[PDB]
Each structure stands twice: as C-alpha cells, then as structure tokens.
Amino acid sequence: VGSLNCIVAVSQNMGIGKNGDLPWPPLRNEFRYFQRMTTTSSVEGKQNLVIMGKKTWFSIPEKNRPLKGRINLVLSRELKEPPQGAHFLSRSLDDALKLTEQPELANKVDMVWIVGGSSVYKEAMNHPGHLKLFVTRIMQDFESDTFFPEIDLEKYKLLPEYPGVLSDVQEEKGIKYKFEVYEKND
Numbered sequence: 735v736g737s738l739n740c741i742v743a744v745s746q747n748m749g750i751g752k753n754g755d756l757p758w759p760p761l762r763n764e765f766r767y768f769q770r771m772t773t774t775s776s777v778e779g780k781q782n783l784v785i786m787g788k789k790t791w792f793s794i795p796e797k798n799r800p801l802k803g804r805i806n807l808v809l810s811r812e813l814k815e816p817p818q819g820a821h822f823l824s825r826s827l828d829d830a831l832k833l834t835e836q837p838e839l840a841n842k843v844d845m846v847w848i849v850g851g852s853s854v855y856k857e858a859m860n861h862p863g864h865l866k867l868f869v870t871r872i873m874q875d876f877e878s879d880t881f882f883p884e885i886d887l888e889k890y891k892l893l894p895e896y897p898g899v900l901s902d903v904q905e906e907k908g909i910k911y912k913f914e915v916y917e918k919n920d
C-alpha cells in the first residue's frame with residue numbers, strides 16, 4: 735500500500751455536510767475532481783481503497799454507492815457486516831490500515847483515501863507518519879451541521895503546486911472554489 739490521503743470539500747465556515755448531504759448545490763466538475771483523485775492508481779498495488787464512516791456511506795446516492803473502481807471500506811462499531819454494496823468493514827482506522835497489508839489487500843491496493851466522517855478526518859489527521867490533505871475550498875458560507883477539524887498549519891504545509899491539480903480559482907453554478915493540497919510528516 736502506497737500513500738495515505740484525505741480529501742474534503744469545505745465551505746467558508748468549514749462545513750462539510752447538512753442533514754447528510756452537501757451544504758451547497760451539486761458542483762459537477764468538483765465531483766469530477768473527487769472522482770479522478772480517488773480512482774487513478776499505480777505503483778504499490780493496482781486500485782485505490784476508499785475509507786469512510788457509516789454516515790458518509792449512506793450520504794452517497796444509491797445509484798453510485800459502491801464508488802465504481804475503488805475498494806470501499808466502511809468504518810463502524812455498530813455494524814456487524816458491511817452495508818449492501820460495500821466491500822469491507824472495520825471497527826476503526828488502525829484496524830482498517832492493518833487490513834491493507836494482510837494477504838487480502840496488501841498486493842491489490844495502492845493509495846488509501848479517507849473521504850468521510852469528521853471523526854475519521856480528525857483521527858486520520860492525527861495519524862502519525864506521512865499524510866496529505868486534498869482540500870477543495872468552497873468560497874462562501876453554507877448552512878452546515880457537520881464540520882471539518884481545524885488544520886494545524888504548524889505541521890501541515892500548503893504546497894505551492896501539485897501536478898494534476900488546478901491552482902487558480904474555479905467557478906460553477908455561481909460558486910467559486912479553489913483546490914489546495916497540504917502535506918505533513920509526523
């Protein structure tokens with residue numbers, strides 16, 4: 735298994751969801767970015783592993799629930815078995831990461847992308863080692879009920895550029911957004 739990454743789309747107030755959905759209107763090209771990022775793979779395996787919380791899983795339309803082309807792993811303590819459409823289940827992140835190097839996944843997996851739950855984000859960011867945060871900055875206030883943990887700029891450095899990532903401001907449906915990538919080694 736390669737790299738450990740987190741991806742998120744945050745609004746001005748640092749909101750990531752509103753009643754189990756996006757605080758803002760659907761932004762196509764942004765969804766496109768989410769998709770390509772988490773899907774494209776290479777060295778160390780062949781396919782990416784997407785780790786998400788229970789609520790995150792259910793937050794995705796049933797239509798494309800099992801994110802096509804990625805190994806889907808749900809994190810929960812309540813669940814006894816992975817929800818319909820899901821591939822693997824884990825009790826926690828440290829449990830989920832350990833899984834990634836045992837026979838079952840070790841060869842198969844490249845990158846691991848954390849995509850959901852404020853609690854998952856929070857813990858991942860705390861995870862010791864090399865990590866990158868792929869953040870989409872939605873440049874407006876949106877009514878939220880769930881938020882993204884504060885990023886400690888004392889350890890996370892915002893990179894000047896990243897290959898494949900547009901560094902200028904985007905706009906869709908009258909909403910302007912920016913792509914940012916932060917890296918850390920702890």
Ligand SMILES: Nc1nc(=O)c2nc(CNc3ccc(C(=O)N[C@@H](CCC(=O)O)C(=O)O)cc3)cnc2[nH]1
Pocket residue numbers: 741742743762764765766768769790793794795798801802849850869870
């Ligand atoms: N940058 C970013 N943007 C998001 O919208 C995002 N959303 C979440 C959590 N919620 C969801 C909800 C639905 C889908 C989804 O239905 N994804 C399709 C997108 C394809 C397209 O619409 O063009 C996918 O297959 O990945 C993904 C994430 C986590 N990180 C994100 N990170």
